[PDB]
């Protein structure tokens, strides 16, 4: 997981915000699944009581 | 020539794009010419064979 944080200060100072009060933090990742043998998976669909 | 490059990542992250995916590169220059004696320049206008 890639975490990126930009605390308020000089680094956040910009034309839109000349003072630099705001900040943010973000997280992102990649994911995927490979099914080697689909024959070994099984499933039973049923209803459930209250 | 002045060249500026900003690779994607921490330096590209901003309020508009918190993740920082994009990037760019730019080049600019100043040019000017001064003609002292235009009489010394010569020209002959003609057509050219195919």
Helix residue spans in A1-50 (DSSP H):
none
Beta carbons of A4 and B15 less than 8 Å apart:
no
Kind plus residue range of the DSSP H or E element containing B47: none
The CA dihedral of A16, A17, A22, A27, to the nearest 10 degrees, is: 30
Residues with Cβ < 8 Å from B10, sequence gap 6 or more?
A: A4, A6, B20
The tokens for B9 are 């990542």
Q: Please, which residues have CB within 8 angstroms of residue B9's CB and are 6 or more apart in sequence?
A: B20
What residues of B are in contact with residue A6 (Cβ under 8 Å)? 10, 13
How many Å apart are CA B28 and CA B3, to the nearest integer?
7
With breaks defined as C to next N over 2.5 Å, after which residues does chain B break? none
Q: Determination method here?
A: cryo-EM
């Amino acid at each position: 997981f890639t975490v990126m944080t930009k605390m308020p200060g000089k680094e956040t100072a910009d034309r839109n915000d000349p003072y630099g009060e705001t900040g943010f933090s973000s997280i992102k990742w990649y994911y995927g699944i490979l099914v080697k043998r689909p024959e070994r998976l099984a499933l039973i669909k049923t209803v459930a009581p209250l």
